Design a protein around this ligand. Sequence first.
Ligand code: PPS
Ligand code: 4NS
Ligand code: NPO
Ligand code: NPO
Length: 294
Amino acid sequence: TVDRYLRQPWSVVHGIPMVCAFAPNWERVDNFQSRPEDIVVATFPKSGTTWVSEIVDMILQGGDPEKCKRDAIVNRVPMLEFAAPGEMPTGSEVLATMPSPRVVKSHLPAHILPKSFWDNGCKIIYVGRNAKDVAVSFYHFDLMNKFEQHPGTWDQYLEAFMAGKVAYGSWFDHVRGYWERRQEHPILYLFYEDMKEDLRREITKVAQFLGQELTEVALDAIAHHTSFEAMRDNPSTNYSTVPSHLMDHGVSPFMRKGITGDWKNHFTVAQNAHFDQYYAQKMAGTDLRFRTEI
Ligand SMILES: Nc1ncnc2c1ncn2[C@@H]1O[C@H](COP(=O)(O)OS(=O)(=O)O)[C@@H](OP(=O)(O)O)[C@H]1O
Ligand SMILES: O=[N+]([O-])c1ccc(OS(=O)(=O)O)cc1
Ligand SMILES: O=[N+]([O-])c1ccc(O)cc1
Ligand SMILES: O=[N+]([O-])c1ccc(O)cc1
């Protein structure tokens, strides 16, 4: 029943390209009923959502890794806009029956994140990642994830990415929207590259934002269990439990490489020069900055 939605071109919701299966019945998102205690993990796709979601869940579980092995991360931190009509309950439905504090994953740009989150002051942990690594990660994700329109060749996908035609729209607008919105809302704005550089330093910031005090032993336990190698090999986080019909893990694993700088292996000399020139144009006039190497 979900098959007719898979591998279809993007729909559009409020002007933003959307995964085809997610777009029907968008009222369930516009009218989502949030709670003041909800913690939103918001990201442009492929920017560290799963990484930060696991950190948050481990903090809320007191640093106990066994409690995070209870279920897969797709169920522990439901995506707000997820839907697979006819095969699974929507993410919004699953969230309705989840005890506070809920951890809510989403890729929606700030201006179409449901109004209830803004009205309830919900804590948002935002993660940004440099756009070149994001583009590489999202291309390979679209090769393996059958919810996505097929991406074609890398060069054509990159053009679509730069133009903001991909699911969830323009990366530039996404990262700058949440950077600006912190002026009116409690947002912790994290960088994937910072997390590669010093993971404990970023876990500590997440714990403080959540009001949670970590012993040194719990901090080391969280850092040890949220390394790329740990989450790649952990069935609860590596998405290997997703049916192969939805995610072909042999095309490209979800936990694919986990580095900063893989863009140097995929961007041609010409693509890189052109991207850098466009990026400088699009990022002029913001103080927000990303690192492409650490
Ligand atoms: N612990 C840890 N350390 C380092 N890197 C990590 C980690 N967990 C996930 N990743 C990498 O993040 C990419 C997945 O991003 P998301 O989780 O945002 O994907 S999604 O939007 O939720 O589908 C994807 O990046 P790439 O490997 O570059 O494709 C994952 O490998
Ligand atoms: O993709 N980025 O995030 C990106 C690209 C270029 C850039 O600066 S440059 O000096 O390498 O052009 C910084 C960040
Ligand atoms: O996080 N996710 O599972 C995703 C992310 C992007 C996308 O286009 C579809 C699903
Ligand atoms: O939980 N799931 O089955 C999923 C979740 C996200 C996704 O992109 C594809 C499948």
